[PDB]
């Protein structure tokens, strides 16, 4: 009956935790001892992208590690040449209420989504000189919080309808829909092999999903408040989260639990974006205290701040070659830190 | 210079995009952003039907001031994760049905929504245009059913003028910042036209009281 099902869910969660704590042979923070710390390293800004006129909510790097895309509330999807601070494109969005943007791994396509519950896919390399919508991916019953291009034809979107969904650009329909996530999903991060993806929601739980199978493979809990951002380790077997609970937690896929809590007593603001540097030795976390804290991802200490923003940092991401990290913020400014 | 014949024109493209973005941002800065809120089925659509799925953005022009109102009540998500998008709105057009004081109570749910948005950290310094509408149903409901059948804390009688003004004073009393922001309360019905004038007249007071605060004048 109903009593057994609640008891079964309670005993299964206890059974998951019983096996989870048994595998905790040694914490990663204790394991990473007698190692050389990264140290206080200053990463001064190199280029300041100064085109946006409203709060920037998302940015993404091209796989060439030079092209950049960014979305703000002035109804603009600016494409940056980060090397020379040049505007490659500026796309007028029909709905200025966007909370995410994405760059295709190929580079031909750029996505954006937000409060209009629609993922708009923009074709950059058209025969015409303008940037036009390929297919608007309507079908979500909540705000679109994050989106990431799988291929030129596949993109999985994290929405405010408490569900994630993998789409298909050719047909415009969700090939699979990822359900079972109580509370609305606020961010997602595709794997380097583009096979699995995790997603952070307002249940303070990060769930790993199989893209093809459509099944929630694993659940990661431990955050006290809602998760605003997530990011895979470059290896693809681990990921770090960013939550309003004011700590970043590194979850391992195989270990199926936490590794560290990147928490400081002097910091109470909630993380808005999280990005792993190449080799995963540095974690770039975009905090809400007008600053990004560069966390040495293998230790519990901080590798330094970069600051340089007059408002809350809302988006940041390192390049695909690790050359630089761009940190957008609500002050309509993008700074390339290196 | 050390600029190629194509890097010179790539810079020219960037310079010419900035001229388009400045022109787009100067046009977007003259559009008044209003965040429409209030409980569902509380006369919200009434104060939109006089002029001109997630956000139902509504644009209406009044006295050479381009407005832009965001009917956001269709989100049905955790509002704490997308209400920060509406920083810098001129006012919050809150719509509360007066007749919904007894239909578990809509007024208590609507009063709780006013608490959650007047005391919000993102809206600590923006005004609220409270719209106590559907007085026509409120008039017939007060005469047929006294307010003491649902509200025993009321001291006044079951009249109209003192009962309606009681809800006005019971809704501008939850502002934890009585001086940083001002609730501009209006009374409207279905057969009314001055509601759009009240929104234009209120935001002019919002703009000026921000303009005076800009150049240290008030």
């Amino acid at each position: 009956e109903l009593d057994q099902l609640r008891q079964e869910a309670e005993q299964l969660k206890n059974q998951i935790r019983d096996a989870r704590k048994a595998c905790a042979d040694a914490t990663l923070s204790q394991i990473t001892n007698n190692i050389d710390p990264v140290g206080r390293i200053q990463m001064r800004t190199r280029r300041t992208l100064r085109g946006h006129l409203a709060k920037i909510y998302a940015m993404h790097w091209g796989t060439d590690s030079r092209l950049l895309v960014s979305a703000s509330q002035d109804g603009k999807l600016i494409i940056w040449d980060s090397y020379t601070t040049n505007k490659v494109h500026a796309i007028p969005l029909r709905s200025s209420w966007v909370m995410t943007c994405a760059y295709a791994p190929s580079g031909n396509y750029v996505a954006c989504g937000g409060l209009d519950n629609i993922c708009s896919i923009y074709n950059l390399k058209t025969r015409e000189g303008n940037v036009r919508v390929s297919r608007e991916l309507a079908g979500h019953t909540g705000y679109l919080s994050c989106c990431r291009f799988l291929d030129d034809n596949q993109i999985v979107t994290s929405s405010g309808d408490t569900t994630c969904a993998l789409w298909d650009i050719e047909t415009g329909q969700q090939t699979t829909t990822f359900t079972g996530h109580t509370g609305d999903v606020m961010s997602l991060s595709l794997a380097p092999d583009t096979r699995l993806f995790v997603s952070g929601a307002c249940d303070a739980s990060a769930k790993l999903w199989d893209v093809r199978e459509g099944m929630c493979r694993q659940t990661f809990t431990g955050h006290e408040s809602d998760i605003n951002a997530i990011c895979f380790f470059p290896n693809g077997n681990a990921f770090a989260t960013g939550s309003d609970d004011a700590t970043c937690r590194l979850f391992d896929l195989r270990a199926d639990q936490e590794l560290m809590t990147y928490s400081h007593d002097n910091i109470i603001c909630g993380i808005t974006s999280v990005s792993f540097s190449k080799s995963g030795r540095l974690l770039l976390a975009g905090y809400d205290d007008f600053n990004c804290n560069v966390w040495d991802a293998l230790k519990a200490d901080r590798a330094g701040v970069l600051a340089g923003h007059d408002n809350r940092v809302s988006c940041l991401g390192v390049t695909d070659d690790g050359m630089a990290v761009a940190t957008g913020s609500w002050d309509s400014f993008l700074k390339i830190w290196n | 210079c050390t600029l190629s014949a194509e890097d010179k024109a790539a810079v020219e493209r960037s310079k010419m995009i900035d001229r388009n973005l400045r022109e787009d941002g100067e046009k977007a800065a003259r559009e008044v952003k209003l965040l429409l809120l209030g409980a569902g089925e509380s006369g919200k659509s009434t104060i939109v039907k006089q002029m001109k799925t997630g956000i139902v953005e509504t644009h209406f022009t009044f006295k050479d001031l381009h407005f832009k109102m965001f009917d956001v009540g269709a989100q049905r998500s955790e509002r704490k994760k997308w209400i920060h998008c509406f920083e810098g709105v001129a006012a919050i057009i809150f719509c509360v049905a007066l007749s919904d004081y007894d239909l578990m109570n809509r007024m208590h749910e609507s009063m709780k929504l006013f608490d959650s948005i007047c005391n919000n950290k993102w809206f600590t310094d923006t005004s609220i245009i409270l719209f106590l509408n559907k007085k026509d149903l409120f008039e017939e409901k007060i005469k047929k059913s006294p307010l003491t059948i649902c509200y025993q804390e009321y001291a006044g009688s079951n009249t109209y003028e003192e009962a309606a003004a009681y809800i006005q004073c019971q809704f501008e009393d939850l502002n934890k910042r009585k001086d940083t922001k001002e609730i501009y309360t209006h009374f409207t019905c279905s057969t009314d036209t001055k509601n759009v004038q009240f929104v234009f007249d209120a935001v002019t007071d919002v703009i000026i009281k921000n303009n005076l605060k800009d150049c240290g004048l008030f």
Partner: single-chain antibody, 232 residues
């Protein structure tokens, strides 16, 4: 995507003739337009370049001053006004579009151009190969010679490879050292380094034959190579 160039014809010496291009099918207002001439017996020769929004305007040193260029962004129309048409202006003036951003492919689409007839510092681009005979299905690697290195400090080598098939407007093949254009087969492969430049084809069909033109874009004025006419 088309560029219907209008005007032109038989013009008396010393007169003027307004050349117009009816650009359509694309976002013309963000395209830096060009003009490329071609004598009936000689090779291509660049004429002018008006950037987007009627910005920076360049001219060839041969016809600078007496050639004045203009564009009409709302009408999607590109004009070229020239006065005192000498005996050396009996060339076919092609109209080219070109956009400049990172990863862009300038000179990608060329208009069919107009025929003009009259009554009667720079980087040198030379290709000693001409009237090259080759059978289809083989591999041909023609070469183009530059006066100096086209490789820049940023790392972009502004060499361009075109293909004027017999009786048709030129078509871009390789818009950099090796950057293959969009809409052309993968068989084409430009190469070379520094001053020496070459364009290689894996196998050639009966279609990709004609005269191949090499062109620099390092700085203005832009100079084309001579006629490298592939023969079947």
């Amino acid at each position: 995507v088309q560029l219907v160039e209008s005007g032109g014809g038989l013009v008396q010496p010393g007169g003027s003739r307004k050349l117009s291009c009816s650009a359509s099918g694309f976002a013309f207002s963000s395209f830096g337009m060009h003009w490329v001439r071609q004598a009936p017996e000689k090779g291509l020769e660049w004429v002018a370049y008006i950037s987007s929004g009627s910005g920076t305007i360049y001219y060839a040193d041969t016809v600078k001053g007496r050639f004045t260029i203009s564009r009409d962004d709302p009408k999607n129309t590109l004009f070229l006004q020239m006065t005192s048409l000498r005996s050396e202006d009996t060339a076919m003036y092609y109209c080219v579009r070109s956009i400049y951003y990172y990863g862009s492919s300038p000179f990608d689409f060329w208009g069919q151009g107009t025929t003009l007839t009259v009554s009667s510092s720079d980087i040198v681009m030379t290709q000693a190969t001409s009237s090259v005979p080759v059978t289809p299905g083989e591999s041909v690697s023609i070469s183009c010679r530059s006066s100096k290195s086209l490789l820049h400090s940023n790392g972009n080598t502004y060499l361009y490879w075109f293909l004027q098939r017999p009786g048709q407007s030129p078509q871009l093949l390789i818009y950099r050292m090796s950057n293959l254009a969009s809409g052309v087969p993968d068989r084409f492969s430009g190469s070379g380094s520094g001053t020496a430049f070459t364009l290689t084809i894996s196998r050639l069909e009966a279609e990709d034959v004609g005269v191949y033109y090499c062109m620099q874009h390092l700085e203005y004025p832009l100079t084309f190579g001579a006629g490298t006419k592939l023969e079947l």
